[PDB]
Write a structure and sequence with these properties.
This is Endothiapepsin. By secondary structure, the protein is mostly beta strands. It contains 4 helices and 24 strands. The structure holds the ligand Cc1cc(C)c(/C=N/NC(=O)[C@@H](N)Cc2c[nH]c3ccccc23)c(C)c1 (3 copies). The site of one ligand 1TZ has 4 residues, from loops.
């Protein structure tokens, strides 16, 4: 089997991408944030604290003839950014772009943090990291991809995120028309439960490539590109007037600037992030200071190849017995 679904930016800055997902019988369609940095499929629901719902579409398990309470199961997730959610668990039928999994754990939120409440366009998250990170207790549950994997034509999914435009998540096949040149594959460590890999280096604009190992995670659920402070300083030093602002929370730059590109290495291959992808617009309405799309990972504890990086590539998440990651230009 295969599935193919369009993913759409939630706003004019590509702050996140939402993908329609059918849950239950009859289908209830919710727009979920596909997150390769976590392993829980959770949704706003009829059980979510009323004051914590602000415009989201909710899953109502009582209206699904295929929903079953997973007796005694609870979940609770604390994301590294300080966001969180928790609740109980149903199993139900879940379909993405024509690919159907029966008995999928659907984690119904009773509580969500303010960040989620404020994101009216995101009805929940669909985790695509390794199932070892799933938070359901006392019986850990499998991700949608893990449940689908054996049935798929090939045990893979691909992320093709658009810049200021829709893109595509495919399951079970590689669309050879969706990228240019070749796909370069690189090793993955699953030791921390993430799609963790090692970039071979970077360049800023037309500058020379610096060969250096950068270990990080491919995370479709993170907006920005978080890299070591040395790398990030080297990038922003090429932008007149750019500076790190403790008050804003990262590097900002004059909105009048033209940003240089940023290149990252994948083996001997190179992915170029155009400068425009690194512009996140005014820090507040009407400001001439703009927020940067490349930020320091210092204090996160891991480097994160978020959407700013991933949207410059066609990315293969290969879930074979020994997982790997593939990157192509597009
Ligand atoms: C899912 C998601 C992620 C991010 C980084 C933002 C940005 N917001 N930055 C701001 O300055 C909003 N006031 C949003 C809106 C949603
Ligand atoms: C200090 C710091 C700052 C950030 C922005 C992250 C990213 N975290 N990103 C994620 O955890 C995503 N995989 C999922 C996610 C967290 N918060 C969200 C809000 C809206 C949509 C998705 C997420 C971290 C780990 C640490
Ligand atoms: C993931 C994340 C990380 C940071 C450092 C901020 C702070 N932002 N501070 C501000 O003053 C923002 N209004 C700046 C901003 C403008 N556009 C954005 C798009 C994404 C993230 C932040 C901003 C936020 C909101 C989210």
């Amino acid at each position: 089997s295969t599935g193919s679904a369009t993913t759409t930016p939630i706003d004019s800055l590509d702050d996140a991408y939402i993908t329609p997902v059918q849950i239950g019988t009859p289908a209830q369609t919710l727009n979920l944030d596909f997150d390769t940095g976590s392993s829980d499929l959770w949704v706003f629901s009829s059980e979510t604290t009323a004051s914590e719902v602000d415009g989201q579409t909710i899953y109502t398990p009582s209206k699904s003839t295929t929903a079953k309470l997973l007796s005694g199961a609870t979940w609770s997730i604390s994301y590294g950014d300080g966001s969180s959610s928790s609740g109980d668990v149903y199993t139900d039928t879940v379909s993405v772009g024509g690919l159907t999994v029966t008995g999928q754990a659907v984690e119904s939120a009773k509580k969500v943090s303010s960040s989620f409440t404020e994101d009216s366009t995101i009805d929940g998250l669909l985790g695509l990291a390794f199932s070892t990170l799933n938070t359901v207790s006392p019986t850990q549950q499998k991700t949608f991809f893990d449940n689908a994997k054996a049935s798929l034509d090939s045990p893979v999914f691909t992320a093709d995120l658009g810049y200021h435009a829709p893109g595509t998540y495919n399951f079970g096949f590689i669309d050879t028309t969706a990228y240019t040149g070749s796909i370069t594959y690189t090793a993955v460590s699953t030791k921390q439960g993430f799609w963790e890999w090692t970039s071979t280096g970077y360049a800023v604009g037309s500058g020379t490539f610096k060969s250096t190992s950068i270990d990080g995670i491919a995370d479709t659920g993170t907006t920005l590109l978080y890299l070591p402070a040395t790398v990030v300083s080297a990038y922003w030093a090429q932008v007149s007037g750019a500076k790190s602002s403790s008050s804003v929370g990262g590097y900002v730059f004059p909105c009048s600037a033209t940003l240089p590109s940023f290149t990252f290495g994948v083996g001997s291959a190179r992915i170029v992030i155009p400068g425009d992808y690194i512009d996140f617009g005014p820090i507040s309405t009407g400001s001439s200071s703009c927020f940067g799309g490349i930020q320091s990972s210092a204090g996160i504890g891991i480097n994160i190849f978020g959407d700013v990086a991933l949207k410059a590539a066609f990315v293969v998440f290969n879930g074979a017995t020994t997982p790997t990651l593939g990157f192509a230009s597009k």
